[PDB]
């Protein structure tokens, strides 16, 4: 079976100059001012939203349709719950001191 | 910089014979820093074109502008052995 | 005879490690290729013989069309042997192999060596017949391993295909025991049969 | 020639085995050794009490062994020399068989021009290693097995048969040593590499099922009790007296349940002396698993010691000791506070699969799915200088 390798894409400095100037847009590989960085926060959150939905759905279709179990998916997603922050802890109180400072 | 030597005129000449209109694109990639500078196209000028003034018929029915990347280097071969005309870039939206 | 492309389906199986032809069948099927390949050239030197395998987990291309006998054997040396025939599947890849050619004037024929009985079905083979005669591909079955201890229903498909074609379809029986596999296919019609309009 | 070989073994044999012999004459004569390879393989199922089979195999070892797959020479021989309980005899015959395969292979790789014959040498080393384990020369096998391991990792085109013999042999090594944890995982690797092809018997399924269950109970880090339950192997045999309790012990641990678990443990002290000196271990083990289940199943991750105390039927002093043992073992990471009386856990090792655990994960994502969706509208709308 096939093991996902993540990707980020790269080019030598030979190729790259021709990429940067041929492009005639804003670019998701570069950025300008504050205004573009407000855009980025909306786009980044939208990706989470869509991706969460796929996880729930996958959990549904396992107990409905009854596709075979994967402890690779279920096991990784077990970790997510212990990593999860919660509220009312001394840690969140330390965030608020930093928010006043900044 | 983009210019042509004698040896490259001999190479140029036979592509001209094979395909009536043909171009030579010359890339100097170590005076290139915007991926676009010091890249020009060139094309043979005939010996008939100089003496009977049929050289600048390529300044007409086009934009009629030539944008230099090397002022010194282009101008030398612009009368001697080539005429340079400016280069453009393109893509479809799938590509972009 | 003249201008003919022929996709050899050569099976490599668990019935071919038997030694009814010297020193097993793998060794006798190597010798079949040489005679076939030369003979074609003798009629017309612009003949090409291709090769695919009905063997293993997935039938695959072992070699493409070529004017060299050397390249075709070069590809055959590394074949599977664990598999069995898949007859329906063999025909659909061979049809694809005969599409890609230098010229298209060449005749379309498939000759398939049977060493092992079908792992597919009768339901599939009925369909294959209607498919083939639209494109004038002949089915020509050299059987020698589905008559050793078996029976074949492939007689039906030969006749269903045969019409005026580029190459006619006929059934070529070769004893399963010793009779020297290589000379029997060479002696029997494989270019002595030709088409008509 | 072969006529004497087959005729003698008939008298020694049971009458119901008489046709088989005659079928070995028949497929010799046809010169079709495809059906012969199947007939020999079949022979040892019907005649595993009598080593008529071993004497039969001798003739066919020296004849077809390149005119039949070598994979099949290793399958019928293995049943014969495993169940041989004279193991000097086993070693001697196997070593002579290896010398014939080493000569053969050099000409025959180019001669057939379709076949391989280097595959066979690896498997003989595995059989040689098994004979040493039974004989109780566990060290001799393990260092043979390590050199064999090296060769296998550098190949990627090797059959599914090769891996099956190697793991089986490695499991028997940990069972002699009684490493419970090590046995569990390497027997799981045998199960995966199982072939529809005859290289198993009906006996072997029931006996792996017994040995797995026993190892599991007594592991120091296992929690693959639910993984076993769901597995075919242990599913089919629960209706026999030996495997009845054995199922119910495995089941009571999965589910954390004490009322069924402790009731079973009384019986097994008397019954089985293996489990009459692990009595202390097994009671700590059920409590240990339950501890991880109660905090985790909740969406609050931090939990008072009191709730644990009625649950694991232990006072507070042992609660802290249970928790400490887990951290050591690398099953949890976290803290103990006897000031605030809290256990605050923060890393968990994978839970058992069960439909209802799935349900609790799926419901848990719901809670925070709402927040992403509602916030995604607020931020979009807001900002009038998003690109102005």
UniProtKB/Swiss-Prot annotation, chain A:
Post-translational modification: N-acetylated by NAT1.
Domain of life: Eukaryota
Residues annotated as signal peptide: none
Chain's role: Acts as a regulatory subunit of the 26S proteasome which is involved in the ATP-dependent degradation of ubiquitinated proteins.
Similarity comment: family membership: Belongs to the peptidase M67A family.
Miscellaneous section: Present with 19800 molecules/cell in log phase SD medium.
Protein name from the UniProt record: 26S proteasome regulatory subunit RPN8
Gene: RPN8
Curated annotation (Swiss-Prot), chain B:
Protein name: Ubiquitin carboxyl-terminal hydrolase RPN11
From-to range in the entire protein, with total length: 115 to 210 of 306
Gene name linked to the record: RPN11
Transmembrane segments: none
Functional description taken from the UniProt entry: Component of the lid subcomplex of the 26S proteasome, a multiprotein complex involved in the ATP-dependent degradation of ubiquitinated proteins. RPN11 is the only catalytically active member of the lid and serves as the essential deubiquitinase of the proteasome.
PTM entry text: N-acetylated by NAT3.
Entry domain remark: The JAMM motif is required for the deubiquitination and degradation of ubiquitinated substrates.
Residues at which Zn(2+) binds: 8
Family membership noted in the UniProt record: Belongs to the peptidase M67A family.
Assembly behavior: Component of the lid subcomplex of the 19S proteasome regulatory particle complex (also named PA700 complex). The 26S proteasome consists of a 20S proteasome core and two 19S regulatory subunits. Interacts directly with RPN8 and STS1.
Misc note: Present with 16400 molecules/cell in log phase SD medium.
Organism of derivation: Saccharomyces cerevisiae (strain ATCC 204508 / S288c) (Baker's yeast)
From Swiss-Prot, chain C:
Recorded name of the encoding gene: RPN10
Record's protein name: 26S proteasome regulatory subunit RPN10
Note: Present with 17200 molecules/cell in log phase SD medium.
Molecular function GO labels: K48-linked polyubiquitin modification-dependent protein binding; polyubiquitin modification-dependent protein binding
Residues of the full protein shown: 1 to 197 of 268
Function: Multiubiquitin binding protein.
Similarity comment: family membership: Belongs to the proteasome subunit S5A family.
Cellular compartments per GO CC: cytosol; nucleus; proteasome complex; proteasome regulatory particle, base subcomplex
A Gene Ontology biological process term: ubiquitin-dependent protein catabolic process
Coiled coil: none
Ranges of residues in domain VWFA: 5-190
UniProt subunit comment: The 26S proteasome is composed of a core protease, known as the 20S proteasome, capped at one or both ends by the 19S regulatory complex (RC). The RC is composed of at least 18 different subunits in two subcomplexes, the base and the lid, which form the portions proximal and distal to the 20S proteolytic core, respectively.
UniProtKB/Swiss-Prot annotation, chain D:
Pfam family, one: Rpn9_C
PROSITE patterns for this protein: PCI
Domain of life: Eukaryota
Cytoplasm among keywords: no
Example of a GO cellular component annotation carried by this entry: proteasome regulatory particle, lid subcomplex
GO BP of this protein: proteasome assembly; proteasome-mediated ubiquitin-dependent protein catabolic process; ubiquitin-dependent protein catabolic process
Record carries keyword Metal-binding: no
Residue ranges of domain PCI in the record: 182-350
Disulphide bonds in the chain: none
Membrane-crossing segments per the record: none
Any GO MF annotation of the entry: structural molecule activity
InterPro entries to which the protein is assigned, alphabetical: PCI_dom, PSD13_N, PSMD13, Rpn9_C, WH_DNA-bd_sf
Keywords attached to this entry: Proteasome
Family to which the UniProt record says this protein belongs: Belongs to the proteasome subunit S11 family.
Note: Present with 12400 molecules/cell in log phase SD medium.
PANTHER family for the chain: 26S PROTEASOME NON-ATPASE REGULATORY SUBUNIT 13
Function: Acts as a regulatory subunit of the 26S proteasome which is involved in the ATP-dependent degradation of ubiquitinated proteins.
Name of the featured protein: 26S proteasome regulatory subunit RPN9
Source organism: Saccharomyces cerevisiae (strain ATCC 204508 / S288c) (Baker's yeast)
